[PDB]
Design a protein around this ligand. Structure first.
Ligand SMILES: CCCCCCCCCCCCO[C@H]1O[C@H](CO)[C@@H](O[C@H]2O[C@H](CO)[C@@H](O)[C@H](O)[C@H]2O)[C@H](O)[C@H]1O
Ligand SMILES: CCCCCCCCCCCCO[C@H]1O[C@H](CO)[C@@H](O[C@H]2O[C@H](CO)[C@@H](O)[C@H](O)[C@H]2O)[C@H](O)[C@H]1O
Ligand code: SF4
Ligand code: SF4
Lengths: 81, 65, 138
């Protein structure tokens, strides 16, 4: 929000867990203690489109994201062209 | 073994799939320290293909007891 | 173009990529290394070859030009590299910046993950009515 879908979980470990999703997610930002110690929910999200490929894999244990962003550029949908 | 480590625990959060149901546990945390210890485990799966999650004693309401 | 002909990533024709909206706005382009002359797969449906130069193909939009990886790393190579071209220069230094390979640690940059309160009992709906004085612009 403008890209606000929560995939968070609690492990935020990313080995045999989740990577998939065009650019958007440059994480591994180890918070001071969370097991395989890499955490949070995103990096700078003003770049790419609206997947839920975002979970599909590696837990969000609650929801999982999808489209919810509304304010929606174009670069933010393939088609501005 | 002497007190109780991981021998039967309900879940109470309301987000967690098997929430009110009580399945089995495992290597619950040792140290003073963090906030998401405890593995739990039960037969029934859930919305993901793999479901074996870690909740944490602020809560586990087990409740009686 | 030709009088300046600086190419690298072989192709021939195609009604696929780049068209009007990559001048009038933004541009997007990927670059890479490679060993010896090898025939690839392509975004936009087609398919060609390699060898070198910069190995610098230009691409319509950046979801398009990382898929060289989603297969173009099932075909050897550390190094593949896409930036952002404008119609004039910079800010948005795309695969530039710091480190690379989304899954390491130097800094933390953005992200956060929480909102105000965390995933916990937001059976709590939408709170205040949206009013210019209580920290809900984030
Ligand atoms: C058993 C006979 C062999 C002698 C070795 C002794 C066994 C006990 C020590 C095991 C740990 C050694 O370190 C070892 O960590 C990982 C696998 O564990 C590997 O590293 C890998 O796993 C890391 C987690 O640790 C990941 O973040 C990395 O993506 C990956 O590089 C190391 O490349 C390896 O060197
Ligand atoms: C704190 C983490 C986020 C918010 C709650 C976290 C999840 C739920 C567990 C929190 C349980 C504790 O609830 C908490 O309510 C209020 C928030 O500090 C505190 O309420 C108190 O806050 C201060 C001292 O504590 C005093 O200045 C206040 O007069 C008093 O009302 C309670 O003393 C505390 O018990
Ligand atoms: S839950 Fe998803 S991406 Fe979130 S912390 Fe794990 S794998 Fe990382
Ligand atoms: S889930 Fe969202 S942020 Fe993640 S990759 Fe898909 S679109 Fe991007």
């Amino acid at each position: 929000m403008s890209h606000s879908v929560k995939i968070y979980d609690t492990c935020i470990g990313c080995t045999q867990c989740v990577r998939a999703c065009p650019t958007d997610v440059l994480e591994m930002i180890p918070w001071g203690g969370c097991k395989a110690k890499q955490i949070a929910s995103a990096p700078r999200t003003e770049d790419c489109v609206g997947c839920k490929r975002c979970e599909s894999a590696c837990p969000t244990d609650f929801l999982s994201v999808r489209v919810y962003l509304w304010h929606e550029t174009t670069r933010s949908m393939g088609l501005a062209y | 073994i002497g007190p109780k480590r991981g021998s039967k625990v309900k879940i109470l959060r309301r987000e967690s799939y098997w929430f009110k149901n009580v399945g089995s546990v495992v290597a619950v945390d040792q140290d003073p320290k963090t906030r998401y210890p405890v593995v739990v485990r039960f037969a029934k799966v859930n919305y993901a293909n793999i479901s074996t999650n870690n909740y944490a004693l602020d809560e586990v309401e087990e409740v009686a007891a | 173009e030709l009088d300046p002909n600086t190419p690298s990533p072989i192709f021939a024709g195609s009604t696929g990529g780049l068209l009007r909206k990559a001048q009038v706005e933004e541009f997007y382009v990927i670059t890479w290394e490679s060993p010896k002359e090898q025939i690839f797969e392509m975004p936009t449906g087609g398919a060609a070859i390699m060898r070198e130069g910069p190995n610098l193909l230009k691409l319509a939009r950046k979801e398009q030009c990382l898929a060289l990886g989603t297969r173009l790393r099932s075909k050897y190579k550390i190094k593949y590299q896409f930036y952002r071209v404008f119609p004039s220069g910079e800010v948005q230094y795309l695969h530039p910046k710091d480190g690379v390979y989304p899954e390491k640690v130097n800094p933390g940059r953005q992200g956060v993950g929480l909102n105000m309160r965390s995933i916990g009992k937001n059976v709590s709906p939408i709170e205040v009515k949206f009013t210019g004085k209580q920290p809900y612009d984030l």
